[PDB]
């Protein structure tokens with residue numbers, strides 16, 4: 001009940017090793033001061049083009065179709081790369097790696113979007129979000145100005161993120177919060193459910209211990225985080241549904257196969 005402090009540190013380390021962008025770095029950039037190099041602000045067609053024209057960034061994107069789809073492709077490509085980082089993060093958790101590969105896939109399948117939305121909060125403020133490794137900032141107004149359905153995808157995530165960031169979690173908190181999301185014993189079709197539940201429980205106890213040390217004055221922070229985890233599950237449900245509509249009504253839009261596997265039988 002004290003080596004929990006070690007468990008946490010192993011998880012913070014797996015986090016620091018596998019994620020391209022920490023919240024700490026993200027916030028130093030969004031707050032402007034500390035990095036002395038402002039991100040390129042993308043807020044219309046003209047600046048988006050300036051940004052593709054080298055100021056910030058193709059990138060193995062599917063064939064061009066139109067502005068709203070191009071932005072979709074940028075987000076989709078980032079999503080896939082974050083799935084890849086989350087996969088490595090989870091694998092750097094010894095307990096996770098002991099599970100059979102089919103249980104690993106089940107947990108990633110059902111957890112990555114929840115985790116992704118939680119980490120989006122790190123690179124977001126009420127006005128927009130960091131793209132291209134911190135070197136760009138895409139405004140929330142611009143994303144809202146895109147053709148429906150694409151202008152509806154990210155909005156609920158901003159709404160989640162602004163409330164989420166109010167809790168002032170740091171990376172060490174987030175490492176445990178993402179672990180708890182991946183290591184969930186409720187995911188449909190798990191094989192060794194007792195094993196995963198067991199690992200989940202350790203992580204949650206580690207998280208509460210961690211939060212006491214790290215946020216001594218914060219009242220009810222653990223329960224609030226358990227609620228947020230439930231909010232995320234609702235978020236992913238809606239995302240999958242929107243993505244179902246884009247697949248049905250937006251046929252010129254190329255959907256990445258990995259993400260198609262995730263939504264399949266969700």
Ligand SMILES: COc1ccc(S(=O)(=O)n2cc(CCC(=O)O)c3cc(OC)ccc32)cc1
Nearest residue numbers: 071072075076078079131150153154157243259
């Ligand atoms: C750029 O960094 C990111 C990372 C993730 C997210 S996301 O909200 O999860 N999100 C995911 C997809 C498509 C891929 C999938 O099916 O998940 C997507 C498409 C959009 O079109 C404008 C907007 C947000 C999107 C947004 C920005």
